[PDB]
From a paper:
A successful example of this approach is the allosteric protein [name] which is a molecular switch created by recombining the nonhomologous genes encoding [name] and [name]-1 β-lactamase and subjecting the resulting library to evolutionary pressure. As a consequence, the [name] gene confers a maltose-dependent ampicillin resistance to [name] cells. Intriguingly, [name] activity was serendipitously found to be negatively regulated by Zn2+ at low µM concentrations in a non-competitive and reversible mode, a characteristic that neither parent protein [name] nor [name]-1 possesses. The structure reveals that the [name]-1 and [name] domains are in close proximity to each other connected via two linkers and a bridging Zn2+ ion.
Two types of crystals of [name] were grown in the presence of high zinc concentration (2.5 mM). These crystals belonged to space groups P1 and C2 and were refined to 2.30 and 2.29Å resolution, respectively. Superpositioning of the [name] molecule from the C2 space group onto each of two molecules in the P1 space group yields r.m.s.d.’s of 1.7 Å (619 residues) and 1.6 Å (615 residues) for molecules A and B, respectively. The orientation between [name]’s [name]-1 and [name] domains in the C2 space group is somewhat different compared to that in the P1 space group. When superimposing the [name]-1 domains of the [name] structures, the [name] domain orientation between the two different space group structures is different by about 8.5°: the [name] domain appears to pivot across the [name]-1 surface with [name] residues furthest from the [name]-1 domain shifted more compared to the [name] residues closest to the [name]-1 domain likely a consequence of the bridging Zn2+ and linkers restrictions. The two connecting loops between [name]-1 and [name] could only be resolved in the P1 space group (in both monomers) although these loops, not unexpectedly, have higher temperature factors than most of the rest of the protein; part of these linker regions comprising residues 317–327 and 583–584 are not included in the C2 space group structure due to lack of electron density. Similarly, there are two zinc ions present in the C2 space group structure of [name]. The Zn2+ ions bound to the three different [name] monomers can be grouped in two different classes: the main Zn2+ ion, which bridges the [name]-1 and [name] domains, and the non-interdomain bridging Zn2+ ion. The main Zn2+ ion in the C2 [name] structure bridges the [name]-1 and [name] domains via residues H468 (H112, [name]-1 residue numbering shown in italics and brackets from here on forward), residue E477 (E121), and both oxygens of residue D164 ([name] residue). The (other) non inter-domain bridging Zn2+ ion makes liganding interactions with residues H509 (H153) and H514 (H158) of the [name]-1 domain (in C2 space group).
Numbering used by the authors: 1 to 316, 328 to 582, 585 to 637
The structure:
């Protein structure tokens, strides 16, 4: 059935098939094997048909989502690359091509929508979705519009719908639960409501599809569009002075686009599995291989770290203190605490220094922790910032201090107290005294400075779960106060810590007053060693349940990713949108998702159905 002795490749017409062919000639010269590149019609639908009969191409290129439907039947082969190669790619790209611990494909490129804006019409793009209506009113006066994108398809509309808590299918442990769908939740409804209101207020049109949006932006008629790298060439051709940036926020939370991982899967019926893995590992997944493909058709962002760093260069309220659990894709094994002080340093300077300590930590991981170089970088941090730095690196399992610097001096906790706060919250949940979905209502007066999520939920309210997430990940100050009120205030948090053996850490004040940090003021302070030990008691033992531990870990993970610690260690517009987005579920049940959600959006857009009933009907359709 399948030719013995040569490689046949199936890649889509929109992708750089001619660029992959040049890599095919680079392999042909070195080995002496005829590399064929074919682009047939409906290749993602033809592959289930051909591979089932013991036939088909050796290597298939497609987004990872359909690849789950091949691993179920048995059409894809297991992938065995060494860590010497698995390190060269991003840790999340592999988790997109995993089915039951197995590896079914090599990740090549990452696809995610981004905000594209005309620099001539709009030099400074909006940071939030909420400011777009008033910006559209500004631009209509000049015969232009603010934003035009494909409203017909769920994929283009999802980033906004999912932003405030929407999801396709729940991912827990590793398996996607086909019964837990989040297209019906309050977050999804708020998201769709905003879109519908944009349509109702005539900032957008219900008829706008892919070609109407693309032509309107490329002709300079609209200031913004929403698209992926597959559209970049048409804009280059159009000669519009354009930038690509992070999608706007909605209710203080990032837009949540679907993440496609263009992947190269090896056919299970193929007799050339080893011959294909050589071409993919040693030829394609190199700087030179990706170069040829990216030249033919821009891939956007790539799976190979060395080449993404090069592409990221293309021109087209922070943390004084930090707390992090590292080695996280598997159970975290280390706690890091760092505090910076003084009124001299800018946040960019603070962030730069924290990143350098982070970069130093990852460099010497698995070496046993506490490498002399990292202590040098910490001392260098105190130096450059012109004020005391506190630091501790702790092994989560042993409780052993791997490194310390000013471990027993007091430092203002500031935003780091919020993890301890939500630790107390989850403790009341475990006991039956609290529910993560209990909604809390509040007024304008409750709002303090630096409250990006809470200030957009005045009419809606917020669940305890949303408050903890906003407090930790978005550092929402009002959120922390509202959570403090639930447990009884700063004295109760202090009482909670003393009851679990931490007699150092103290919270005395509310937000924003707890942030002021008067020199040597002992209010709202901790020690690096106190904080790390307390964090350890919360993340090990029986102080929280497994479910609560995992949730505390998951809040901290998003905080660590959004923060400075990992910036210089593992650093694009496509990539940054993908990092805050949703990995597209690799199940055939996704077909039911696409059908129902498309119907829901066109019905809510037209006024055929209300937003509530349109998404209820969609939810019913999925879980049927
Ligand atoms: Zn919300
Ligand atoms: Zn005490």
């Amino acid at each position: 059935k399948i030719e013995e002795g040569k490689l046949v490749i199936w890649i889509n017409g929109d992708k750089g098939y001619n660029g992959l062919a040049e890599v095919g000639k680079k392999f042909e010269k070195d080995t002496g094997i005829k590399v064929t590149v074919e682009h047939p019609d409906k290749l993602e639908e033809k592959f289930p048909q051909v591979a089932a009969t013991g036939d088909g191409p050796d290597i298939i290129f497609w987004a990872h989502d359909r690849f789950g439907g091949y691993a179920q039947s048995g059409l894809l082969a297991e992938i065995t690359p060494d860590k010497a190669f698995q390190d060269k790619l991003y840790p999340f790209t592999w988790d997109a091509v995993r089915y039951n611990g197995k590896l079914i494909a090599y990740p090549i490129a990452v696809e995610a929508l981004s905000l594209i804006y005309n620099k001539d019409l709009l030099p400074n793009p909006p940071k939030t979705w909420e400011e777009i209506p008033a910006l559209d009113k500004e631009l209509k006066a000049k015969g232009k519009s603010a934003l035009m994108f494909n409203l017909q398809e769920p994929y283009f509309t999802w980033p906004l719908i999912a932003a405030d808590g929407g999801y396709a299918f729940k991912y827990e442990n590793g398996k996607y639960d086909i019964k837990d769908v989040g297209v019906d939740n309050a977050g999804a409804k708020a998201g769709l409501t905003f879109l519908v209101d944009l349509i109702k207020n005539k900032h957008m049109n219900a008829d706008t599809d892919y070609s109407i949006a693309e032509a309107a932006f490329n002709k300079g008629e609209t200031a913004m569009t929403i698209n992926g790298p597959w559209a970049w060439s048409n804009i280059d051709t159009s000669k519009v002075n354009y930038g690509v940036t992070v999608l706007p926020t909605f209710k203080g939370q990032p837009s949540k686009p679907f993440v496609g991982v263009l992947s190269a899967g090896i056919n299970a019926a193929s007799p050339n599995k080893e011959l294909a893995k050589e071409f993919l590992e040693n030829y394609l997944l190199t700087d030179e291989g990706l170069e040829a493909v990216n030249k033919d058709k821009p891939l956007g962002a790539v799976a190979l770290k060395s080449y993404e760093e090069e592409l990221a260069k293309d021109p087209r309220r922070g943390s004084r203190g930090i707390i992090a659990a590292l080695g996280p894709d598997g159970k975290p094994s280390r706690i890091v605490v760092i505090y910076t002080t003084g009124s001299q340093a800018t946040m960019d300077e603070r962030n730069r220094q924290i990143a350098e300590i982070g970069a130093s930590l990852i460099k010497h991981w698995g070496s046993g922790g506490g490498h002399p170089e990292t202590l040098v970088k910490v001392k260098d941090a105190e130096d450059q910032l012109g004020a005391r730095v506190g630091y501790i690196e702790l092994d989560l399992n042993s409780g052993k201090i791997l490194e310390s610097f000013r471990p027993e001096e007091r430092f203002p906790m500031m935003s780091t107290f919020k993890v301890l706060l939500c630790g107390a919250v989850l403790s009341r949940i475990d006991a039956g005294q609290e529910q993560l979905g209990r909604r809390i209502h509040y007024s304008q007066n409750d709002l303090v400075e630096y409250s990006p999520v809470t200030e957009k939920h005045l009419t809606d309210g917020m669940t305890v779960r949303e408050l903890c997430s906003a407090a930790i990940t978005m550092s929402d100050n009002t959120a922390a106060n509202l959570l403090l009120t639930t447990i009884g205030g700063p004295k109760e948090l202090t009482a909670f810590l003393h009851n679990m053996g931490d007699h150092v850490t103290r919270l005395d004040r509310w937000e924003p007053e707890l942030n002021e940090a008067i020199p040597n003021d002992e209010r709202d302070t901790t020690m690096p060693v106190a904080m790390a030990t307390t964090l350890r008691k919360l993340l090990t033992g029986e102080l929280l349940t497994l479910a609560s531990r995992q949730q505390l870990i998951d809040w901290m993970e998003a905080d660590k990713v959004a923060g400075p610690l990992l910036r210089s260690a593992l650093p694009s517009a496509t990539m940054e949108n993908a990092q805050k987005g949703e990995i597209m579920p690799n199940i055939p049940q996704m077909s039911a998702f696409w059908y129902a959600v498309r119907t829901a959006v066109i019905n809510a857009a037209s006024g055929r159905q209300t937003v509530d009933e349109a998404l209820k009907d969609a939810q019913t359709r999925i879980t049927k």
